[PDB]
């Protein structure tokens, strides 16, 4: 059908331009309405703006003075350029297709109707942090095991969120259980993944966790073994 | 802000909309679990998209006066999330903001016991002049545990960090716990424990340097 | 002096004023809704339309404006002579005559342009005038088949009593409950087409079989005469009729909709000095009536 | 509502002072029928 995927810096310094993009898959870009929504921690869902299939700009007056949503039909990709960002602009930015509804209650001839928009399909989300602190890659340290056993990988000090953990480049998927990160008082997150493993296969099968931190362009692997 | 609401497992939920309309209305309902993509449940006052259970049902405005309410029959444990009411009506203008989040919490869920797994410091980080214990807790409900570290038999309380209980896919909660140590403080002790008290019971997992 | 703001185009207003209570030394800041046609300027500062011309009297909210059939009777020793002639025009010698003591049930419908709920003509559609060659004489055309017209104010208005003195309560328009919509009237475009044809036929008998008969809207005047002025369920409508008189006729589902406005300070007849405030009618107003006559005026094709 | 008071009628009806020269005295009245009754 139609699916979207966002992508962006993930980290932008204060007082700067927050660029973002969203590639949609399985449908034409110039025959639907598209809408940007962010969700800050603790705050509610905030509707940024929306662009029509006729490429018309209409933004939330809460922002407006900083938003400029664009769209390139050569691809199935549309952008989002919030500028003069502050600390509060940290949120999970979502990409959702809006559809137009016309609610008629009286006479269409006198204009006794109003337009309502509803978003049906959503992008997965893209975390964006604002901090003057620079990016920093992590460092994976292996957690060796000892019927059933448990082994994992420790992903120490990194910044900012997030990191993606895969086992055997995607082959080992049953029994995996990655845990939420932990923000130390130093200002860096520390994440840990673990895979429950049958005890007989400890000495035979090989286990490698694939850790990736996008804001640092770092792809690192490691091996776990008693 | 957030509105608390509590139903029982398998009952019917009556989520009233935050703002009541002045004219004819077109209300959308959204389901949003924190740190996840919002789910459109009902877009026209009563119309649901493809892939939403029939147990979800919104009220249509055939006659004015009837306020918009989201009905969830046979509430599962997976129905715990925030529910927004996107209200449009003929009298008020362009409704930019979504509703007031109604945070539904299902009561009477199965009380599950935690799974504690303590790992010793790795050889690479020990060779890097830094020690770190990691005490992984998972599959507990209600998601609220307190972690207590002990060196041999003495409490630590110094240099500990604990995740807030985040919710898993299986509707239970999980949280990590990291105790940062120096490579000599971990070698000069006989044992290290991770007391994880859940509800009214504690679970101990000990790890020694050998 | 009124402090008025628009209501959430710009026709009906929302006006707050300082008003006298039941005690002569106490005021009250009450608000009431008013249609545009009832106020004039000086928050913006407004004022009721009548204040600089005439005193104003609120219609008692228990008397009805409903046309009731009235019969005029002559005293003893007098009589009334009917006219049974099915094709009898204005003047002349009525061939068939009868005598009655009272007239038929005449409904005193106050209307403009379109004669409502009246009595039809048998046989053919008649047309009457003093001198039809005189352009300054209204043509009184009477239909034979009624064309139905449906009018409604769809707003759900509410009435609010305001004690302005001992035993003195002014009924104010509280607020609209639900959608804000336009008042209007529907006529069947087909039935109004065939009725204009019946009229245009008898119009040729006096002006020529080859001359073309054209209908236009009004050319000027006050609201009462430029619009289909009438009363529906107690509220005084003023309907634009340009959609009914916009046809040119040569020698040889459907609905028309009329944008009607609403007023409340009405001078009724032509008296300048006696204005009336019609209190607001609670609920949704709709009425159904026949337009059985017409009042045309040829231009001095 | 010194204490603050108000006449009883003010919130219901206007009020009219009886002219102080008319008398409330019951005077014998006779009802008569017309001629032919
Ligand atoms: C005097 O003369 C006057 C003029 O001649 C005359 O004025 C007329 O007044 C009446 C009454 O006041 C007006 O009637 C209203 O009509 C509204 C509009 O209805 C039309 O449009 C809708 C929507 O159409 C879109 O969607 C359908 C699919 O649903 C598509 O098929 C369409 O093509 C269209 O989709 C395209 O277009 C959109 C733009 O509009 C695009 O955005 C979109 O992307 C697409 O490209 C249709 O559903 C209607 O179809 C009905 O009509 C056909 C014949 O045409 C009938 O056979 C059949 O019954 C159809 O149902 C129609 O075409 C109505 O919306 C309105 O009724 C709603 O509003 C009132 C008040 O608000 C509610 O009380 C009422 O209950 C209705 O609410 C329902 O619908 C809304 C909107 O979906 C819901 O949100 C709401 O919760 C409720 O849902 C419930 O009912 C649904 C069914 O209605 C049901 O599905 C739900 O499950 C739920 O139970 C009202 O009736 C009329 O418009 C005036 N005329 C004109 C020309 O303006 C006057 O009456 C005369 N007489 C007098 C004054 O006495
Ligand atoms: C014509 O114009 C008049 C004004 O001259 C309008 O009358 C006012 O209408 C507004 C609403 O549009 C009224 O405001 C509402 O007042 C309610 C009463 O609360 C008061 O009393 C409580 C004590 O119980 C106080 O705590 C409170 O502060 C108020 O003083 C409120 O309940 C309403 O609150 C709503 O809005 C707020 C902020 O927007 C929200 O946070 C709330 O959740 C809630 O949704 C609101 O404030 C006002 O009272 C009216 N004035 C009078 C004198 O009656 C007419 O409505 C208008 N009519 C039309 C048709 O246009
Ligand atoms: C032309 O003539 C028409 C009919 O002769 C007029 O229509 C009449 O309009 C008045 C007011 O607009 C209506 O009176 C209203 O009645 C409703 C309720 O009526 C209903 O309930 C009663 C029960 O008692 C029932 O008997 C009726 O049949 C209705 O079903 C009230 O709520 C109002 O307050 C008000 O009293 C008449 O009912 C209505 N008659 C008909 C037959 O529709 C029309 O107004 C005339 N046009 C003009 C311009 O004068
Ligand atoms: C109600 O709305 C109308 C329509 O916008 C307003 O009309 C405007 O009035 C100003 C004078 O103050 C003019 O300069 C504009 O040109 C008018 N606009 C239009 C479209 O006619 C009116 O002022 C509003 N009334 C109130 C009380 O707010
Ligand atoms: C409007 O239409 C007709 C007038 O031609 C009236 O309905 C007819 O009334 C006569 C006598 O009252 C009856 O004999 C017919 O049977 C009626 N026809 C139908 C279809 O009902 C109607 O009452 C008129 N309304 C008015 C004048 O207010
Ligand atoms: C118009 O509005 C009034 C209220 O302003 C509505 O009256 C209500 O009617 C329901 C029954 O449908 C009653 O339960 C309520 O108690 C009534 N309210 C009041 C204040 O009396 C009326 O139904 C509305 N009508 C339309 C056609 O919209
Ligand atoms: C005016 O209103 C009347 C009644 O409200 C309408 O008459 C109805 O017409 C429909 C369609 O033919 C019938 O199904 C109903 O039975 C009729 N009602 C009655 C009481 O007989 C009429 O169509 C309307 N006309 C216009 C021009 O609006
Ligand atoms: C009522 O009178 C007071 C007296 O100062 C004035 O301030 C206020 O504006 C008046 N209200 C209105 C609606 O005129
Ligand atoms: C009354 O006021 C109106 C304002 O609309 C003005 O045009 C008119 O001349 C005034 N009439 C009289 C008789 O004072
Ligand atoms: C009415 O008819 C008579 C005789 O048919 C005729 O003399 C008279 O002019 C007619 N009235 C009008 C206004 O034409
Ligand atoms: C009559 O029609 C003309 C043109 O259609 C329009 O400009 C004018 O305002 C109309 N008059 C009335 C009273 O509707
Ligand atoms: C009547 O309607 C016509 C068009 O429908 C419009 O041009 C005209 O202005 C209206 N009459 C008045 C008095 O506004
Ligand atoms: C008038 O005031 C009296 C105070 O004694 C009160 O009890 C009564 O309800 C009021 N009546 C009316 C009609 O306002």
Query: Does ligand 10 lie within 6 Å of residue C140's CB atom?
Result: no
The DSSP string of C232-289 is: ETTEEEEE--TTTS-EEE------EEEEEEEESEE--SS-SSEEEEPPPPPEEEEEEE
We find that the CATH architecture of domain B109-210 is: Sandwich (2.60)
Query: DSSP states of chain C as a string?
Result: -EEEEE-----SEEEEEEEE-SSTT-EEEEEEEE-GGGEEE--EEEEEGGGGT-EEEEPPTTS------B--B--TT--EE----TT--SSS--SS--EESB---B-----SSEEES----SSSPEEE-S-TT-TTS-EEEEEEEEEEEEEEEEEEE-EEEEEEETTEEEEEE----S----EEEEE-HHHHHHHHHHHHHHHHHHH-SSS-EEE----S--HHHHTEEEEETTEEEEE--TTTS-EEE------EEEEEEEESEE--SS-SSEEEEPPPPPEEEEEEEEEEEEEE-----
Pick from A47, C166, C142, C113: which is nearest to D9 by CA? C166
Resolution in A: 2.6
Q: Does the domain spanning B1-108 belong to CATH 3.30.70.980?
A: no
The kind and range of the H/E element at A153 are strand A148-158
**Any chain D CB within 8 A of the CB of C22?**
yes
Flag whether D touches B (3+ CB pairs, 8 A cutoff).
Answer: no
Rounded CA separation A16/A82 (Å):
8
Give the start-to-end residue ranges of the domains of chain A.
1-132, 133-226
- The reply to whether ligand 10 has any atom less than 6 angstroms from the CB of C85 is no
How far is the C-alpha of B25 from the C-alpha of B92, rounded, in Å?
A: 10
Ligand nearest the Cα atom of residue A110: 1
Please report all neighbours of C, defined by 3+ CB atom pairs within 8 A. Answer: A, B, D
Region of C138 please: left (phi>0), alpha (psi -120 to 50) or beta: beta
3-state DSSP assignment of residue D11: helix
> Distance between alpha carbon C95 and the CA centroid of its chain, in Å?
36
Domain boundaries, chain B: 1-108, 109-210
**Chain A CB contacts of B49 below 8 Å:** 120
Residue A103's contacts (CB-CB under 8 Å, 6 or more residues apart) are A113, A114, A115, A116, B24, B25, B26, B88, B90
The structure tokens 């493809």 sit at B50
CATH superfamily placement of domain A133-226: Immunoglobulins (2.60.40.10)
Distances (CA, A) of B122 to A150, A213, B134, C9: 14, 21, 10, 74
CB A20 within 8 A of CB A93: yes
Locate C161 and state its tokens. 């009593």
Distance CA C259, CA C217 (A): 14
Query: DSSP assignment of B18-85, as one string?
Result: SS--SSSEEEEEEEE-TTS--EEEESBTTB--TT--TTEEE---SSTT---EEEEES--GGG-SEEEE
Asked if B173 and A177 touch (Cβ cutoff 8 Å), the reply is: no
Structure-derived torsion over alpha carbons of residues C169, C174, C177, C183, reported in degrees to the nearest 10: 90
Contact A78, A30 (CB under 8 A): no
Contact D9 C166 (CB under 8 A): yes
Q: CA C196, C201, C202, C205 torsion: positive or negative? A: positive
DSSP-based three-state secondary structure for A200: helix
- Whether ligand 9 lies within 6 angstroms of the CB of C40 is answered as yes
- Expressed in angstroms and rounded, the spacing between residue C193 Cα and the centre of ligand 4 is 39
H or E element that contains A197: strand A189-198
Q: How was this structure determined?
A: X-ray
- Is B109-210 the same fold as B1-108? yes
Within 8 A of D14 by CB-CB distance, chain C residues are 165-168
């Amino acid at each position: 059908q139609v699916q979207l995927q966002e992508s962006g810096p993930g980290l932008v310094k204060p007082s700067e331009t927050l660029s973002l993009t969203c590639t949609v898959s399985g449908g034409s870009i110039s025959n639907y309405y598209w809408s940007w929504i962010r969700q800050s921690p603790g705050k509610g869902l905030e509707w940024i703006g929306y662009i029509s299939d006729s490429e018309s700009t209409n933004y939330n007056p809460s922002l407006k003075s900083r938003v400029i949503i664009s769209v390139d039909t050569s691809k199935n990709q549309l952008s989002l350029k919030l500028n003069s960002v502050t600390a509060a602009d940290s949120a999970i930015y979502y990409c959702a297709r809006a559809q137009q509804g016309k609610r008629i209650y009286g006479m269409v001839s006198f204009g006794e109707f109003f337009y309502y928009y509803y978003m049906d399909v959503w992008g997965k989300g893209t975390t964006v942090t604002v901090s003057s602190a620079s990016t920093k890659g992590p460092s994976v340290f292996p957690l060796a095991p000892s019927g059933t056993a448990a082994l994992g990988c420790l992903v120490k000090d990194y910044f900012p969120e997030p990191v993606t953990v895969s086992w055997n480049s995607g082959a080992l998927t049953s029994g995996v259980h990655t845990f939420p990160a932990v923000l130390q008082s130093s200002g860096l997150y520390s994440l840990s993944s673990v895979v429950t493993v049958p005890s007989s296969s400890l000495g035979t099968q090989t286990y490698i966790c694939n850790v990736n931190h996008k804001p640092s362009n770092t792809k690192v692997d490691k091996k776990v073994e008693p | 802000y957030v509105r608390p609401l509590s139903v029982a497992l398998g009952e019917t939920a009556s989520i009233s909309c935050g703002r009541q309309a002045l004219g004819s209305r077109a209300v959308q309902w959204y389901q949003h679990r924190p740190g996840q993509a919002p789910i459109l449940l009902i877009y026209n006052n009563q119309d649901r998209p493809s892939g939403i259970p029939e147990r979800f049902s919104g009220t249509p405005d055939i006659n004015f006066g009837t306020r918009a309410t989201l009905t969830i029959s046979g509430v599962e444990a997976g129905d715990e999330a925030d529910y927004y009411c996107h209200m449009w009506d003929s009298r008020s203008g362009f409704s930019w903001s979504f509703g007031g989040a109604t945070r539904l919490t299902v009561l009477g869920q199965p009380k599950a016991a935690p799974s504690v797994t303590l790992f010793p410091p790795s050889s690479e980080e020990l060779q890097a002049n830094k020690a770190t214990l990691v005490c992984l807790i998972s599959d507990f409900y209600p998601g609220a545990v307190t972690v207590a570290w002990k060196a041999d038999s003495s409490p630590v309380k110094a240099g500990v960090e604990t995740t807030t209980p985040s919710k898993q896919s299986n509707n239970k909660y999980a949280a990590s716990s990291y105790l940062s140590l120096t490579p000599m403080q971990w070698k000069m002790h006989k044992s290290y424990s991770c007391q994880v008290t859940h509800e009214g019971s504690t679970v101990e997992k000990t790890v020694a340097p050998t | 002096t009124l402090q008025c703001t628009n209501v959430t185009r710009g026709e009906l207003k929302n006006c707050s004023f300082n008003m006298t209570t039941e005690l002569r030394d106490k005021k009250q800041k009450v608000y009431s809704l008013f249609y545009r046609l009832d106020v004039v300027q000086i928050n913006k500062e407004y004022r009721l339309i009548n204040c600089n011309t005439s005193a104003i009297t609120q219609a008692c909210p228990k008397v009805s404006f409903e046309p009731i059939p009235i019969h005029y009777c002559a005293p003893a020793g007098f009589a009334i002579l009917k006219c049974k002639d099915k094709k009898f025009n204005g003047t002349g010698p009525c061939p068939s005559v009868s005598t009655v003591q009272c007239t038929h049930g005449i409904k005193p419908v106050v209307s403009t342009q379109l004669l409502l709920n009246g009595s039809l003509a048998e046989e053919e559609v008649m047309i009457r005038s003093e001198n039809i060659t005189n352009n300054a004489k209204n043509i009184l055309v009477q239909f034979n088949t009624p064309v139905q017209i449906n009018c409604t104010r769809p707003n759900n208005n509410t009435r609010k009593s305001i004690r302005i003195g001992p035993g003195q309560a002014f009924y104010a328009t509280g607020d609209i409950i639900g959608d804000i919509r336009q008042a209007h009237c529907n006529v069947s475009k087909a039935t109004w087409n065939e009725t204009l044809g019946k009229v245009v036929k008898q119009l040729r008998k006096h002006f020529g079989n080859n001359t073309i008969i054209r209908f236009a809207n009004s050319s000027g005047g006050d609201l009462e005469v430029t619009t289909h002025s009438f009363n529906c369920g107690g509220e005084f409508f003023y309907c634009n009729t340009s959609g009914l008189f916009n046809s040119t006729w040569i020698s040889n589902n459907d609905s028309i909709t009329l944008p009607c406005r609403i007023k409340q300070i009405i001078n009724m007849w032509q008296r300048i000095g006696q204005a009336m405030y019609a209190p607001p009618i609670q609920g949704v107003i709709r009425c159904v009536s026949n337009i059985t006559g017409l009042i045309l005026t040829r231009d001095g094709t």
